[PDB]
Amino acid sequence: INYKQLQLQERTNIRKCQELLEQLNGKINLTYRADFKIPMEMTEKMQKSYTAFAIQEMLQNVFLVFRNNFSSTGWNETIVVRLLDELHQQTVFLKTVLEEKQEERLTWEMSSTALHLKSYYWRVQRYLKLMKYNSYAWMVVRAEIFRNFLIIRRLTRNFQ
Amino acid sequence: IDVYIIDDNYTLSLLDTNVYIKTQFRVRSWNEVDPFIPFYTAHMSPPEVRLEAEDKAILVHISPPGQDGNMWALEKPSFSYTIRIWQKSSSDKKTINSTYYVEKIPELLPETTYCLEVKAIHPSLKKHSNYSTVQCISTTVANKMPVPGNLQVDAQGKSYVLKWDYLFRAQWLPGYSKSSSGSRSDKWKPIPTCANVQTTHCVFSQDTVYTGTFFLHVTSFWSEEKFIDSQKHILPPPPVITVTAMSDTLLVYVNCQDSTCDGLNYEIIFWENTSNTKISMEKDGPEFTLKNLQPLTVYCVQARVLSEKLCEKTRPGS
Numbered sequence A: 001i002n003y004k005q006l007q008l009q010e011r012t013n014i015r016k017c018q019e020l021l022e023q024l025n026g027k028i029n030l031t032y033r034a035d036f037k038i039p040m041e042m043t044e045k046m047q048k049s050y051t052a053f054a055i056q057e058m059l060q061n062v063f064l065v066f067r068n069n070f071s072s073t074g075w076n077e078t079i080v081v082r083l084l085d086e087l088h089q090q091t092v093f094l095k096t097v098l099e100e101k102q103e104e105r106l107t108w109e110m111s112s113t114a115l116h117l118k119s120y121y122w123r124v125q126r127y128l129k130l131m132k133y134n135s136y137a138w139m140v141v142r143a144e145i146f147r148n149f150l151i152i153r154r155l156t157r158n159f160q
Numbered sequence B: 001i002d003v004y005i006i007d008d009n010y011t012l013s014l015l016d017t018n019v020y021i022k023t024q025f026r027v028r029s030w031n032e033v034d035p036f037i038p039f040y041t042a043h044m045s046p047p048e049v050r051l052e053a054e055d056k057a058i059l060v061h062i063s064p065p066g067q068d069g070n071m072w073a074l075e076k077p078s079f080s081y082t083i084r085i086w087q088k089s090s091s092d093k094k095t096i097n098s099t100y101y102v103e104k105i106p107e108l109l110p111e112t113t114y115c116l117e118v119k120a121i122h123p124s125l126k127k128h129s130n131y132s133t134v135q136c137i138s139t140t141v142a143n144k145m146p147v148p149g150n151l152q153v154d155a156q157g158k159s160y161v162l163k164w165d166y167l168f169r170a171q172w173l174p175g176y177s178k179s180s181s182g183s184r185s186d187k188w189k190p191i192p193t194c195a196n197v198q199t200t201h202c203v204f205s206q207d208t209v210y211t212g213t214f215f216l217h218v219t220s221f222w223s224e225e226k227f228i229d230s231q232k233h234i235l236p237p238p239p240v241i242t243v244t245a246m247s248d249t250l251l252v253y254v255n256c257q258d259s260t261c262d263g264l265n266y267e268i269i270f271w272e273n274t275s276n277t278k279i280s281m282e283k284d285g286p287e288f289t290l291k292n293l294q295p296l297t298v299y300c301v302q303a304r305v306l307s308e309k310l311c312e313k314t315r316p317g318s
Helices: A004-022 A048-067 A077-096 A103-109 A112-130 A135-159 B175-179
Strands: B004-006 B009-011 B048-053 B058-063 B080-087 B094-098 B102-105 B113-121 B135-138 B151-155 B159-164 B171-174 B202-205 B213-216 B226-229 B240-245 B250-255 B266-272 B279-283 B287-290 B298-305 B310-313
Touching: A004 A048, A004 A077, A004 A135, A048 A077, A048 A103, A048 A112, A048 A135, A077 B171, A077 B175, A077 B213, A103 A112, A112 A135, B048 B113, B048 B135, B058 B080, B058 B113, B080 B102, B094 B102, B151 B226, B171 B175, B175 B213, B240 B298, B240 B310, B250 B266, B250 B298, B266 B287, B279 B287, B287 B298
Parallel strands: none
Antiparallel strands: B004 B009, B048 B058, B058 B102, B080 B094, B080 B113, B113 B135, B151 B159, B159 B202, B171 B213, B213 B226, B240 B250, B250 B287, B266 B279, B266 B298, B298 B310
16 A cells, blocks of 8 residues: 555546647636635645545535536637546546555544535535526636646645 | 424424524513523424336335425435335235335236325434324336346446346436436436437437436336446455465455545455355455465455455365
């Protein structure tokens, strides 16, 4: 058993997802403002088991996001179908490599950290519904998912 | 006074508050209780289930708790389901586990009436659901034409070869579709290269079947959904196997070709230079010990990490 092998997989895969997200159109404006920010615990140092769950949770939520009506964006459906699938592939992969171990995930689900991460993503899904899934809302979400993928990349250092 | 929460229903439509933040209630006893996060006290209502029958199969269409709501709106991928099937009068229940929102129960007897029960489980957040109200359905009489059998997909990278045993139509569905919540699924995508084929040989390119993972379909009912992952994984290289034939035990050492070798899982494939049967076992560490082998006989070992044939003759007995 080792986390170093999982570090090599999540790095290879977030690159596969970040490329797919980039291919939606061609311009990601990181200054696209919206009041919701990734929880402070994610940027901060966290446990070895807790990271793998944080990744899974983020990929599960990023999946749930792209399921919504993206009709207003004029993005290529083919690429969004492709993205959801590569996202879901890893979501299934992470859950299976944390199958034999069962105690620490329960501790992680009752954590204030996980709750804060889920509170954050609730605000992301709520935002899109309020703005009635128009282009500006998605332009903001794409930029946020980019920033999120970088956080997934920052978290992979916590495995070594 | 206590508050009971069953999904998005409370006890003492389009606009609702955050289920993960601090929330409170005031009713006018002068109600003002302990502030809590609703996500911990909320119960799971049974999943909605609709049955559909065929000759030798039953389709169980599972809808997750909430239509769709907010309490489980972000928990949907976490949920797993357990199905219980039996004939109407029987007491022995067959158990099938599923993550899929449509689980086809096969190998069933035609014109027989079976009853179903679906449980929604949250395998990570401790919680579970009370089984759904029992639902019964009867199978139809066997079709004049049977559905295709064993499927195998051998791919040459950019082209896929679909080999099977028996006009034939084929449909493809992306991997995440059968696994993620319905309401919008499962609309199967078509295949022009295999829509009305004359042969069992089916060839299709990556342009049409664009997802990394997908399911395949093969008036007759639909065949078993064949799931195939298309990944350019030419990793890792074979390990270096070492055999030490001792008096009795035949010690086998698996060495990974990228060290440190601290946390790894190993597999063994051993046989005899006269038999055409392969025996296989997996251990925690790399030190495999082949015990109770016939003496003065040649044994061929092979290994993989999670090798080429290496034949060694045993010892007589000192």
